[PDB]
Amino acid sequence: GSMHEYSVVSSLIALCEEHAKKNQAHKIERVVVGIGERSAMDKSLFVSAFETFREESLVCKDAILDIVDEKVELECKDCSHVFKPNALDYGVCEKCHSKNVIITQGNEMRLLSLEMLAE
Ligand SMILES: [Zn+2]
Structure with a gap:
């Protein structure tokens, strides 16, 4: 098959490393994610994969991943309204x-924000 379950994981950890060099921080403190309550994904499985591949990059190993439980919202197609x-x-x-x-x-899941430690 295909490692699609590690695509999101590898992507986020690479983004952390690419931000930390660019901000000249060379560390993380936190990452924050939003997982929708109808996505049916296990928050525990996703973080456990993120913590597993974390070891690819020295700047990444000093972090934790915080999962916000996100709500559901219904948009209309050709209209101008949105409801629950x-x-x-x-x-x-x-x-x-x-x-x-x-x-x-x-x-659908998305990243929400990240944090870094100066010291
Ligand atoms: Zn409508």
Whole structure:
């Protein structure tokens, strides 16, 4: 198969290393991530992979990864409105009476911010 489960991992750790040389920090303190509550991904599995590959780079080993549990949000296609998943039978858009809405937040993870220690 393919190591797609380590793509996100390798990417983030490389980004940490590339920021720390550019800011001339040569360390990290924290990283902060947002995992949507409908992505069904194990936060424990993702961090355990990040902590495993951490050893690739000396600046990376002094860090911790903080997972924010993120909410779900429903956007409308050709419209101008956004709401929370609640109704079903009458679960149409508030402006336009159709169920054409999509998940803009809740299915997908992203990085939120990073931190570095000067000392
Ligand atoms: Zn709409």
